[PDB]
Amino acid sequence: DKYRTITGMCNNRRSPTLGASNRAFVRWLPAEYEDGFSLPYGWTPGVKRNGFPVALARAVSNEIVRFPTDQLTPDQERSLMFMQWGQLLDHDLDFTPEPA
Amino acid sequence: QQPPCFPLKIPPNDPRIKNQADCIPFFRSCPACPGSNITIRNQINALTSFVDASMVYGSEEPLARNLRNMSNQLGLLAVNQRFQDNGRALLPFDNLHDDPCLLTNRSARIPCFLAGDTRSSEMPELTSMHTLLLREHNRLATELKSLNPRWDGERLYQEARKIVGAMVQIITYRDYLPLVLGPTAMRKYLPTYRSYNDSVDPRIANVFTNAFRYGHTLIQPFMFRLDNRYQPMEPNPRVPLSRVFFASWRVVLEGGIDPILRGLMATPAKLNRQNQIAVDEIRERLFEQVMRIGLDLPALNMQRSRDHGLPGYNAWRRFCGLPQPETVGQLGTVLRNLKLARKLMEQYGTPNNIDIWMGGVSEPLKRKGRVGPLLACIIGTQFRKLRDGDRFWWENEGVFSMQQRQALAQISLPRIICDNTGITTVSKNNIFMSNSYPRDFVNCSTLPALNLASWRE
Amino acid sequence: RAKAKTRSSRAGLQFPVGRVHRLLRKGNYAERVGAGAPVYLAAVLEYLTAEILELAGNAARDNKKTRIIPRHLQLAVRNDEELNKLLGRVTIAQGGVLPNIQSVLLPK
Amino acid sequence: RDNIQGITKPAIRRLARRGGVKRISGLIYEETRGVLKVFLENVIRDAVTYTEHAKRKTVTAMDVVYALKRQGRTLYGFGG
Amino acid sequence: RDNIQGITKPAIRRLARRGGVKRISGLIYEETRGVLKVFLENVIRDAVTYTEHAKRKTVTAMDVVYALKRQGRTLYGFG
Amino acid sequence: KTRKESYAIYVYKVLKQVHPDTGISSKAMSIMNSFVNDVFERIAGEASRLAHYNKRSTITSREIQTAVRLLLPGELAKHAVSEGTKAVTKYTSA
Amino acid sequence: HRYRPGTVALREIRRYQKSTELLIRKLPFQRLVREIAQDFKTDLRFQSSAVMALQEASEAYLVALFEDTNLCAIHAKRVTIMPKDIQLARRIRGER
Ligand code: HEM
């Protein structure tokens, strides 16, 4: 135990597999699905969420996120190293694979 | 719409996608226990939930072995055997069945690089950071071998691995997090370190993978490269971001990583405003060349939040302890904006349904911070858990000697940047804060280096 | 003569650097006062004020109020270890006390 | 001129309730009155000294604040 | 270095005898060691801050005297 | 009438920075004024003592930094120090 | 109907730990302050703020003393506070 294991195994004595790689995420809150088990919201058309229709994510991005580029305001106290280090640290922390 | 596909349906009057039959590609995540129906779906973390410099050393043993240099006894890390930037090492190449780097430009014919992560070649800036880390590890190994010649290659590799891990931890927790959370949130969620605590779960939460995408709001729409005088380097001083995705050939054949680092150090970021969330380059032209159609990064964020089955905005507001709005007026009070609250209500219908990314990036930023109260709560909690649950924390007793701690506490990003490549003029103090040339730049012939003399065995 | 700009604007502060410099000079602290001491003092004072005001505003919001009263300042100070250590021997007027009851006295 | 009895038993009981006290013995009240008189005597003596040095005849709030700060009992809200 | 055990049980017994204590429970030695460690940590931290401000590498008696005085523990006899 | 100086407008500006829609009463402003004066006097007195100990006749930013280190407890001090430095550097650039 | 002993006491504890007002009548306290100050100087005047500040300081002091007294009483395995607890708290604090 002079150095780290590559997989991060046996870091915690109580639960050696806790904190390692290729395991499930921790849910701080119970997951909500449109069927209750594994069906994402918006899978079946016409299913209302809490009495309200499920919005199209592309539509939300179109109305709310979209803004004309020509009035971009630069940050007066941050550099692009801020964004780069954020991305690098994120690539350290987590990566959720998906089937090919 | 069949598994494992969860495409994004195109709404009417879409400014870019006129054909309503077309759908943005999207694949659901890998289940934790496939083949079950009585168990709730959970996702898999493919990487170690620790700040252990795992972007370059790999998280799986076969890949970790493949990354090292086995053709010597210096314990180095393999670099590219065919290309060098002014006599300096580059990332080793990778072979894949379908390589997007080749698809970006057939004439150049440079494949994607290989590192501890498969995403290390999305843009030249990430590749530059990876190459800088690799060069730093190699230089540390060389100086440790000169310092201690009796040492074996495995010992040198492990020692440089520990040094780089502690370096990443120090830089992050000392410079990056205070500039994200701000003084109040950083002091609340990351108090003074006490000691290791095994009763703390260091596993990455599900919401964090969606709550750490705030950086999508800091992306500038252009890539900037600067010469040795921090002037616009020709050719192509500024390049659209749609043409730099997976363009690994822009690293080998376009002057190396020095102009990219120089542009990063001396360019202001983008300020997140309630009416300017994200630029159109990543919203309508993301991965334009590789994919059949451009992607929508914010829409991908909300769709992935839905796919993971994360709760709504109000659930997280209650979880963190903040007041939960219910009506239009309460939402406008919380967001300190009335137009945005009206738009959110007209698109979702209730604050309980707003996605975590939308609520997180639509909140007003903290004082001297770049995230709202909810994102600050989530991020501070996650990083406190990561620090307090890591048994190999650089400040933990026994991991490093006292003199080693004093030597490590003096490291800095500008020292590494101007020590591992050809740039001489670097920013001072917090590199993440200095973005004006030449008002806040130095020659880095004044700032001290890393004193390895405490590593004598 | 150019347009006069305050020293606190150059340092990017809200607290007055010039007034703090005058108070340091007139306060009989030392024979000479450096050029950077007022900036440092103003920055520290503004930081402490912002911290305590943020905590008090959060306490007021938790009470469904809009205006900060001394009760909220007391609740902010006494619920924070560092601020409670800084203000251990300080009384805040109309602040009240922190609600606690010893476990022995509760019915069992 | 026995105004020390103006601090009634219900007032002392309320002050004890704010301090978290559930049951109070019967002899607590005289002891509390003596303690309060001692504290007031010290503070008022210091305040009157401060007032007399200024050649004034009214005891201002700032004199009380300075007298309290002398004993190590800084008070916020009155004066500056 | 576990030098806190260098403050032995008989030494703590002597310090209690000077304080007028007649009978001593067997669990106060660890408590006394913790109390002493906390006190020493505070005073030594202040003394080292005073030393570092003067750009020195030697902790003088005046630094200790000032560190004690600023905690309301004035000590007479060392300048 | 003689002018009475106070730290009221600056405290209000900071409050508007932190909580843009939250007001403050008069007793709370008096308390904040007293707090600012108390902390100023504490730090300035410690800095003066530090200058006198080392036989110097100037109060510099190093004396203020050491006084902040001595007076403010734990994490607070660290953050305060950062803020102070962050100002002086900026003040030097302009 | 009648509540058991100690119930209204706990209700009062919860009630007076939420308020911020002053628990001593103002006129008797003002008379006491004037009587005490009579022994130092004759024909003295008081600002209203002076008497209010004295009242705030005295009430805070007494509340803190009663907290320490309650701790001392609980130490001896008791629920009532006796004068010996006040004396012990004051002696340990250094006041006597
Ligand atoms: C600057 C250019 C960037 C580009 C082109 C980019 C691109 C992408 C894309 C296409 C995804 C997958 C979308 C999805 O399915 O969720 C992704 C994932 C992600 N990105 Fe970025 N990103 C950038 C910067 C950043 C930054 C600065 C951060 C954080 C500070 C960040 C954090 C994340 C996170 C947390 C994920 C989720 C990882 C996962 O769930 O597997 N990204 N990025």
What residue ranges do the domains of chain C occupy?
Answer: 3-108
CB B40 within 8 A of CB A32: no
Expressed as residue numbers, the domain containing E63 is: 3-79
Fold of C3-108: Histone, subunit A (1.10.20)
CB A67 within 8 A of CB B276: yes
Rounded distance from Cα D32 to ligand 1 centre (Å): 67
Question: Is C61–B323 a contact, with Cβ atoms under 8 angstroms apart?
Answer: yes
Verify cis geometry, omega within 30 degrees of 0, for the bond prior to B235: yes
b/e string for D21-51 if b means 16 or more Cβ within 10 A? bbebbeebbebbbebbeebbeebbebbbebb
CA angle B308, B311, B316 (to 5 degrees): 130
**Cis peptide, bond prior to residue B15, ω within 30 of zero:** no
Q: How far apart are CA B216 and CA B302, in angstroms?
A: 13
Q: Are G69 and G89 in contact (CB under 8 A)?
A: yes
| Inter-CA distances, B218 with A59, B283, B304, B454, D69, Å | 22, 13, 20, 40, 50
d(CA A94, ligand 1 centre) in Å: 11
Tell me how many domains chain B contains: 1
Q: Are B373 and B336 in contact (CB under 8 A)?
A: no
Instruction: Provide CB contacts within 8 A for F28, sequence distance 6+.
Output: C56, C68, C69, C70, C72, C73
Residue that is written with structure tokens 């017994």 in the block: E13
Q: Give bridge partners of residue B268 from the DSSP assignment.
A: A79
SS3 A55: coil
CB neighbours of residue G64 within 10 Å: 15
Angle at the Cα of B24 from the Cα atoms of B20 and B27, rounded to 5 degrees: 135
Q: Supply the DSSP string of E4-71, one letter for each residue.
A: GGGS-HHHHHHHHHHTT-----TTHHHHHHHHHHHHHHHHHHHHHHHHHHTT-SS--HHHHHHHHHTT
Q: How far apart are CA A46 and CA A64, in angstroms?
A: 23
What does the DSSP assignment read for B224-277? Answer: E-B-TTSSBPSS-SEEEGGGSTT-THHHHTTT-SHHHHHHHHTSEEE--BTTB-
CA–CA gap between residue F43 and residue F34 (Å, rounded): 14
The DSSP code for B124 is H
Chain D residues closer than 8 Å to F37 by CB: 80
Distance separating alpha carbons of residues B139 and D6, to the nearest angstrom:
82
d(CA B79, CA B404) in angstroms, rounded, equals: 28
Checking chain C for breaks where C and the next N are over 2.5 Å apart, the residues before them are none
User: Residues enclosing ligand 1, CB less than 6 A?
Assistant: A 83, 86-87, 90, 95-96; B 122-123, 209, 212-213, 215-216, 219, 282, 297, 300-301, 304
Surface-to-core class of residue G7, CB atoms within 10 Å of its CB (0-12 exposed, 13-18 middle, 19+ buried):
exposed
Looking at the DSSP assignment, which residues form a beta bridge with residue D55? none
User: What is the rounded CA–CA span in Å between residue G84 and residue B10?
Assistant: 80
Closest CA to B137 of B116, B113, B156, B112: B156
**Catalytically annotated residue among A91, A95, A98, A100:** A91
Per-residue CA distances from B102 to B98, B114, B246, B260 (Å): 9, 14, 9, 21
Question: Is E65 in contact with E79 (CB distance < 8 Å)?
Answer: yes
In this complex, do F17 and B336 lie within 8 Å of one another by their Cβ atoms? Answer: no
Q: What is the helix (H) or strand (E) element at residue A23, kind and residue range?
A: strand A23-24
User: What CATH code is assigned to G1-96?
Assistant: 1.10.20.10
Strand partners, B240: B222
CA distance, residue C3 to nearest chain D CA (Å): 34
* Sign of the alpha-carbon dihedral angle for C76, B370, B130, B431: negative
Contact by Cβ (8 Å): B171, B53: no
**N-terminal to C-terminal alpha carbon distance within chain E:** 32
Going by C-beta distance under 8 Å and a sequence separation of 6 or more, which residues neighbour residue E22?
A: none
Which sign, positive or negative, has the C-alpha torsion E69, C83, C101, G21?
positive
Compare CB distances from C93 to G18, G56, G70 and report the shortest one's residue: G56
G14-53 residues labelled b (16+ CB within 10 A) or e (exposed)? eebbeeeebbbeeebbbebbebbbeebeeebebbebbbbb
| C-alpha–C-alpha distance, residues D42 and E77, integer Å | 32
Ligand 1 mean position, distance from CA B268 (Å): 20
Inspect the interface and report whether the beta carbons of B367 and C51 lie closer than 8 Å.
Answer: no
Nearest CA-CA distance, residue C6 and chain D, Å: 26
Which residue of A81, A90, A93 sits with most ligand 1 atoms within 8 Å of its CB, as the best mutation to test the pocket? Answer: A90
Atom of ligand 1 nearest to the CA of B213: 32
Q: What is the Cα–Cα distance from G23 to F29, expressed in whole angstroms?
A: 24
Measured over the CA atoms of residue B169, residue B172, residue B175 and residue B177, the dihedral's sign is negative
Q: Which domain holds residue B299?
A: 1-457
Most ligand 1 atoms within 8 A of CB, residue of A25, A87, A89, A98 to mutate: A87
Query: Alpha-carbon distance C39 to C12, whole Å?
Result: 10
Q: Which of B24, B204, B288, B297 to mutate to test the pocket of ligand 1 (most atoms within 8 A of CB)?
A: B297
Q: Per the structure, how many domains does chain E have?
A: 1
Instruction: Assign B157 to helix, strand or coil.
Output: helix
Report CA dihedral (B385, B390, B396, B400) to the nearest 10 degrees: -140
CATH class in words for F1-94: mainly alpha
The binding site of B comprises 48, 50, 52, 54, 122-123, 216
What Cα–Cα distance (Å) separates residue E52 from each residue in F57, F62, F66, F82?
19, 11, 9, 18
Asked if A98's CB is within 8 angstroms of B27's CB, the reply is yes
**Per-residue burial over E47-65, b = 16 or more CB atoms within 10 Å of its CB, e = otherwise:** bebbbebeeeeeeeeebbb
User: DSSP string of C64-104?
Assistant: T-SEE-HHHHHHHHHT-HHHHHHTTTEEETT--------TT
Closest CA to B188 of B178, B197, B198, B196: B178
Query: Mutation test of the interface with chain F: which of E53, E56, E66, choosing the one with the most F Cβ atoms within 10 A?
Result: E53
Instruction: Give the helix ranges, DSSP H, for B27-152.
Output: 54-57, 61-67, 100-104, 124-147
- Cα separation, B448 vs B419, in Å, equals 11
Would you list the domain boundaries of chain G? 1-96
Distance CA A36, CA A58 (A): 24
CA G19/CA G15 separation, integer angstroms: 7
One DSSP character per residue, B4-43 reads: TB--EEPPTT-SS---TT-EE--BPPPBSSTT-SSSPP-B
CA distance B165 to B393: 9
DSSP SS3 for B295: strand
Output the domain CATH number for residue B391.
Answer: 1.10.640.10
Contacts of B90 (CB under 8 A, 6+ apart): B79, B80, B83, B84, B113, B131, B251, B252, B256
C27 burial class (0-12, 13-18, 19+ CB within 10 angstroms)? middle
Residues of D in contact with F29 (CB under 8 A): none
Question: Phi and psi (nearest 5°) for B295?
Answer: -100, 170
Q: What are the backbone angles phi and psi of residue B183, rounded to the nearest 5°?
A: -60, -40
Q: What is the resolution of this structure in A?
A: 3.0
Rounded to whole angstroms, the maximal C-alpha distance in chain A is 58
> Bridge partners of D76?
C92
Q: Which are the contacts of G74, defined by CB distance < 8 A and separation ≥ 6?
A: C102, C104
The span from the CA of F66 to the CA of G83, in Å, is 46
CA distance B35 to A58: 31
How many angstroms separate the Cα of F42 from the Cα of each of B10, E65, F7, F38, F82?
A: 64, 19, 17, 6, 19
Q: Is B400 helix (H, G, I), strand (E, B) or coil?
A: strand
Within an 8 Å CB–CB cutoff, is residue D73 touching chain C? Answer: yes
DSSP letters, G20-57, are: -S-SS-HHHHHHHHHHHHTTT-SS-EE-HHHHHHHHHH
What are the φ/ψ torsions at residue B267 (nearest 5 degrees)? Answer: -135, 130
